[PDB]
Amino acid sequence: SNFGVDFVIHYKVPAAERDEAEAGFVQLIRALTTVGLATEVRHGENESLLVFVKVASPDLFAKQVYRARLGDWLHGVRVSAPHNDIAQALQDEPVVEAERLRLIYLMITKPHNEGGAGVTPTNAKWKHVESIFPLHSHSFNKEWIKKWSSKYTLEQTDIDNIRDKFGESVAFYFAFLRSYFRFLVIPSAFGFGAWLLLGQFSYLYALLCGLWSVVFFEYWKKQEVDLAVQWGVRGVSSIQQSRPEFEWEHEAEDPITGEPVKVYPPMKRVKTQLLQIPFALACVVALGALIVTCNSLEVFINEVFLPTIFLVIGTPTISGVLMGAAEKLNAMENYATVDAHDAALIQKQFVLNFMTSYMALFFTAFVYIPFGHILHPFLNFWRATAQTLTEFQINPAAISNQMFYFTVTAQIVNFATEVVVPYIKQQADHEEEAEFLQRVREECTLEEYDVSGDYREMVMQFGYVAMFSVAWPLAACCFLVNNWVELRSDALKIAISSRRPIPWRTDSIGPWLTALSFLSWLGSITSSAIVYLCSNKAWGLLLSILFAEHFYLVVQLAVRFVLSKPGLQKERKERFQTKKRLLQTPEEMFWQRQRGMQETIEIGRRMIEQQL
Amino acid sequence: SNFGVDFVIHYKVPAAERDEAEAGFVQLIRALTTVGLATEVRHGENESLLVFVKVASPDLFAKQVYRARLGDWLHGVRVSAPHNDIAQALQDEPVVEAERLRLIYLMITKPHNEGGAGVTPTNAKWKHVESIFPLHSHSFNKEWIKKWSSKYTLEQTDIDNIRDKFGESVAFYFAFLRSYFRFLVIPSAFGFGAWLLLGQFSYLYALLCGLWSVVFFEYWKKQEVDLAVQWGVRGVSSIQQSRPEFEWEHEAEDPITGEPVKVYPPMKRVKTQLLQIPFALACVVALGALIVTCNSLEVFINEVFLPTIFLVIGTPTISGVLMGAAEKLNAMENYATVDAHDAALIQKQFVLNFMTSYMALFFTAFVYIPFGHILHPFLNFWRATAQTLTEFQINPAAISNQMFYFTVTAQIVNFATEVVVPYIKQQADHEEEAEFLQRVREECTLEEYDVSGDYREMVMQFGYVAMFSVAWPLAACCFLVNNWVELRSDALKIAISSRRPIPWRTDSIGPWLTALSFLSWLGSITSSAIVYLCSNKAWGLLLSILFAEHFYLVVQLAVRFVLSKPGLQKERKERFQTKKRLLQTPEEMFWQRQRGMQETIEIGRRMIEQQL
Ligand SMILES: [Ca+2]
């Protein structure tokens, strides 16, 4: 439905600095025109000038895509270079929309040293440029949402459509979510089969959960490389993309393969990097104190679960401000590549969300149950406060109720915040095309969509399954429905409540693979510990931990060995085919006695005859 | 000193079947001549006919080496194909002796389908051919032994000489031995610094040994790939070399990249493969019974260490017969590739030698010390036997004496058997060249040298260091001297007491990498267990095991992370250099308003001016 547009830039302007903005606009448009993109300017809103661009000459676009395909080829991404004749390259393997959008964005963003015109709104003097974004297509979305909501199971072609259009990382996230939702059936079924017929806090369920977690992790790891090979996006993690916000002080010549490269003394970076530990300790101390007071108030009411519900409802705000502070801190220290910078924010975000999510259960299952004397002083303080306003309690198992109140009453709140609140906030010259202009203006005021949060939510849901499902086997039953709803909720959020993300290629899901392994390993211990501490000396607990951890390790080894036996065979066949295609006195006087071959047999026969 | 000879074949003949041997000899020589190798025949000993061959026409040899280099190139071994002009290929990168010997052997051994003439003495009717082997060079050995024995530390060039001449696997074994001997200094020094000033059975020593084992293993793993890249022998493990002794029943077409390939139903192979477990259990039961009686006799003398010494002296024979039985069993089941067959024999050999070496210490440190009531019945039986020939003993720590008697009195015996006994056994027409013929005849009666046993001995010495050095910190002190002696003892055994092995390329040391990791992991637990059980309830032992194992895991992770930061950079530079070398109504009526670029700036300026 769009007018053939490709990219839109905002370029807000000030009121007391309009003189300094006209020169910047002139420089920006002059740089943009030299690259070879067709541009147009239209009135925006609240001091904005929308700039719409696409590629003008298809010949230059073909040259650029050929150069990009070549550059991918020499980096090992491809295994078949294209011929130096642009007649079948876009015919046998036509360019997809995502690839064209990525190439246009790379041409717009890269500096002159590579073939582009650097207009990054952060590094250089482009302080007036707000954001560069592509446009949506309502015709595609109205059909996609209905098609996805009118079915039950998503086939491979449904994910391939998102890969073709919406990019690569989004496709990987959706494939991972679909695979995880499909795999969640087994723990759901075998927890429903143990919640009604296998007593409470069964020991078999913990081992079964550990085995299922290992199997799912390894199967997803295999399907990951399979999908990477299928989409031809394997090995892109090796490409070290640079960053525009990087800062340096001097250029250091590289002895081997030397081009001008910027460097940062590692000692200076570490001097700021180690600041994370004191900040993490200071934040976790305060959060633990808050949890302690909340649980003390909750247990005081037993002497006459509201504090737990209030804490769950109120923790999103503190989590958000702490996450914003962590994001701000990551900018204080500098990263050269964009992979390292993105792999460092994920670690901090995961640590913070883990400590703000699992610690409420940890302080109730591993602290209050073994020895509740720690909460004694808090109980006494609360009793004294209640008395001034005008004996011994032993909890049998509070983990069962807390897990239910942390799953059922938290999934609803999370879904409400994710869907309904944006839905409610969504209701808060001049020729015959102004509808498109109004749509564009309403599009640029939204927020850029990032897959980090959606990955984090699913990672921590998997953790909740891994380390705490033994206290409530019905958790997977609710999680199945929640994930089925989420598979369309996230699609809707992408479609209507967020601008279309810039397609970025990625081989893997990122550093989340290590997080899943760590969560599974820790769950393999915590589940058995909870089973022992709830089912009721101290010698047996360590033995149970031994059995659980070593069974987990043995299961991991066995599953790896089994799965060591797809797209790898197709790649090997292609490599073999291309290989076949490219395929097309003591010396002079010693053996002078026996020159030819015929007499040697005669000599041997004579030797045999004489031997007898 | 040799007469330019390259390979020697034996071809023994019978007395009642000489008629059937002449035809085989004629066929063998006819097949050999067609390939293009110069041959000669000389009288052997006890019904043998020595056949000496080398390459005849250097042009055919150049063609063969070019074809071999190409075939290596398309398999990813190389990163730079040679040009189709044989003028500088042997000049810039001249062929080494080992490569020429390997190529000649491959030409001799391979069937006609690849370019050779299959003369394997096992599969086909070549029942008369005994062995095909290359000849030594006494001039090289007399200098090499003296040079190695006249120095202290072996530099890289010394190993590179063996790589150039004696092959690849031998060079890898010698490099591994040198690196391990160099790394053994640290545990030796810090055990000498703890045997005199840190009491007995120190807890710090176990953690230090675990850390040293992890560091050495990871450093060797890095140096392994470094040496593989340096020698240009990286990735050869991917090449699946076939086997001549393989048997099949029919040929199954391969759908993808289909050439005639022989197959074996996996169920039939497994039906014989699972027989290992009952055999292993039956052998370990008998060996454990023998150990139990030996230790009972040893402890009975205390009521008035000879049985331990007798058992150590007598165990080589039982180990040898059991190893021969295991080798015979491996032939009963069939393996297609030569890598899988060699990787299966190593597992059985390692398991057998582990159970015949470490179990004597295991039954004394983990069974008798915690509860000696198991040896009660044996003590009573021995006492009854002694009485018929015509109260309670608690051992404080017998592991300290047993470790000394299993190290000092076993290294001497092993060295004697390895060196002195072969030395003693070494003293047990007709023109002016018969000295060479006598040397050749005395050469072919020796035994083929294999690096499996030398790898196994060092692996189990490393195990003894890993899991039992805490009971005797001076073990590394003796092991340093033993390894320094062995570094020349094995070279001498190769030089004089064994025929020159056929040079076989190998990227890695083999499956021994997993064995080292398993030994280190098990030692990280056993050392702490011994420390607790010797230093003196049952609750603390599991906690100590927790601390030891998790410290080992954390140290492994930290060392891997540290070492993640050589030849890989050189390979990347070569790849970059070769890459650089190969490098050289709603549409028509919308933007028709703003065709060029000059008027767009004017329009934007007018919009800005009107906006205010
Ligand atoms: Ca949600």
Ligand SMILES: [Ca+2]
């Ligand atoms: Ca979500």
Ligand SMILES: [Ca+2]
């Ligand atoms: Ca020896």
Ligand SMILES: [Ca+2]
């Ligand atoms: Ca040896």
